[PDB]
Design an enzyme around this catalytic site. Structure first.
Site, PDB file in Angstrom:
ATOM      1  N   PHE A   1      34.767 -27.476 -45.262  1.00 36.82           N
ATOM      2  CA  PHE A   1      35.690 -26.954 -46.273  1.00 36.82           C
ATOM      3  C   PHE A   1      35.448 -27.674 -47.590  1.00 36.82           C
ATOM      4  CE2 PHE A   1      40.317 -26.539 -47.701  1.00 36.82           C
ATOM      5  CZ  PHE A   1      40.404 -25.165 -47.609  1.00 36.82           C
TER       6      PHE A   1
ATOM      7  N   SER B   1      32.855 -30.647 -39.796  1.00 38.24           N
ATOM      8  CA  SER B   1      34.249 -30.438 -40.199  1.00 38.24           C
ATOM      9  C   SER B   1      34.646 -28.999 -39.863  1.00 38.24           C
ATOM     10  CB  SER B   1      34.409 -30.846 -41.668  1.00 38.24           C
ATOM     11  OG  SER B   1      35.778 -31.071 -42.006  1.00 38.24           O
ATOM     12  N   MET B   2      35.143 -28.192 -40.810  1.00 36.75           N
ATOM     13  CA  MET B   2      35.373 -26.789 -40.466  1.00 36.75           C
ATOM     14  C   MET B   2      34.090 -26.106 -40.008  1.00 36.75           C
ATOM     15  SD  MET B   2      38.242 -25.134 -42.887  1.00 36.75           S
ATOM     16  CE  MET B   2      39.792 -25.969 -43.242  1.00 36.75           C
TER      17      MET B   2
ATOM     18  N   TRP C   1      36.628 -29.796 -37.089  1.00 36.04           N
ATOM     19  CA  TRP C   1      38.023 -29.496 -37.370  1.00 36.04           C
ATOM     20  C   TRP C   1      38.274 -28.056 -36.943  1.00 36.04           C
ATOM     21  CZ3 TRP C   1      41.240 -26.053 -39.660  1.00 36.04           C
ATOM     22  CH2 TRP C   1      42.528 -26.478 -40.021  1.00 36.04           C
TER      23      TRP C   1
ATOM     24  N   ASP D   1      38.166 -41.251 -38.127  1.00 33.63           N
ATOM     25  CA  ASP D   1      38.318 -40.032 -38.908  1.00 33.63           C
ATOM     26  C   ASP D   1      39.801 -39.717 -39.082  1.00 33.63           C
ATOM     27  OD1 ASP D   1      38.278 -37.378 -39.825  1.00 33.63           O
ATOM     28  OD2 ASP D   1      36.528 -36.850 -38.592  1.00 33.63           O
TER      29      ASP D   1
ATOM     30  N   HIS E   1      35.451 -39.563 -41.607  1.00 35.50           N
ATOM     31  CA  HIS E   1      35.093 -38.149 -41.543  1.00 35.50           C
ATOM     32  C   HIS E   1      33.762 -37.846 -42.217  1.00 35.50           C
ATOM     33  CE1 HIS E   1      36.034 -33.980 -40.895  1.00 35.50           C
ATOM     34  NE2 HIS E   1      35.867 -33.675 -42.169  1.00 35.50           N
TER      35      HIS E   1
END
Length: 259
Positions: A62, A130-131, A155, A176, A208
């Protein structure tokens, strides 16, 4: 004997070097030229004399562009893989959308790209941060023929992944605070009840943003997992089974040995 095996018998030093044994070529994919994802960059071994290679599509997270992960392009490709690193349709696309875009990138690579003849379309994989790591799981849920999946600090509000059959390595950062491992990575890992094999690599004291910088331990395990499962290259099991000890830069490792 394994028709997909490539490159020299592996060692710790080969895996930790900045490049693997293949020179790498690159091709830009303009956003103007494709639908279903935002374009990106393809990295591939220059040589064709050793056969075709498996391929991996990789998504950033993201707010991010492919440049946030770009070091992975040449590093992974130089071990004998075709890498398509994507830009997403917008920087704010959600995990499920990123998963569809990863699959669109693999389809483009194998069906229409100018390097399609270098890729073994039966040996494909996904990864992302992540995303984009959430989207890696979505892609594996949708396409059970994928040979490997590597969610990196993933995520996702979807916590369970029973449809996934693909060998999946989740790489988490112990510290994270954006996709905390206790609420993202580890629940995902425990939910992979039908993955043929799986592993969880937790990087000691990592935030993260560990994958934004060349990280030799991260790369070692990503390359080993890709070799073992995209290429069926059992030589790389030596790095996965038995599992590494949780010491130094590894705060936890969970496994399904034997593979």
């Amino acid at each position: 004997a394994n028709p997909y095996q490539r490159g020299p018998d592996p060692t710790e030093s080969l895996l930790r070097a900045a490049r693997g044994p293949f020179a790498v070529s690159e091709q830009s994919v303009s956003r103007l030229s494709v639908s279903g994802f935002g374009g990106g960059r393809i990295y591939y071994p220059t040589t064709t004399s050793q056969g075709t290679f498996g391929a991996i599509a990789i998504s950033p997270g993201f707010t991010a562009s492919w440049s946030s992960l770009a070091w992975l392009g040449p590093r992974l490709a130089s071990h004998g893989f075709v890498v398509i690193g994507i830009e997403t349709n917008t920087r704010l696309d959600q995990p499920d959308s990123r998963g569809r875009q990863l699959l669109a990138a693999l389809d483009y690579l194998t069906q229409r790209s100018s390097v399609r003849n270098r890729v073994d379309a039966s040996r494909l994989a996904v990864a992302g941060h992540s995303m984009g790591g959430g989207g890696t799981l979505e892609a594996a849920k949708s396409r059970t023929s994928l040979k490997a999946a590597i969610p990196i600090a993933p995520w996702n509000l979807d916590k369970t992944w029973p449809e996934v059959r693909t060998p999946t390595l989740i790489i988490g950062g112990e510290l994270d605070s954006i996709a905390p491992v206790a609420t993202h990575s580890i629940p995902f890992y425990n939910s992979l009840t039908n993955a043929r094999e799986k592993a969880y690599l937790e990087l000691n004291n990592a935030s993260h943003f560990f994958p934004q910088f060349s990280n030799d331990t991260m790369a070692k395990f990503m390359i080993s997992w890709m070799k073992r499962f995209i290429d069926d290259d059992t030589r790389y099991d030596q790095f996965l089974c038995p599992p590494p000890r949780a010491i130094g830069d590894i705060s936890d490792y969970r496994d399904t040995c034997p593979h």
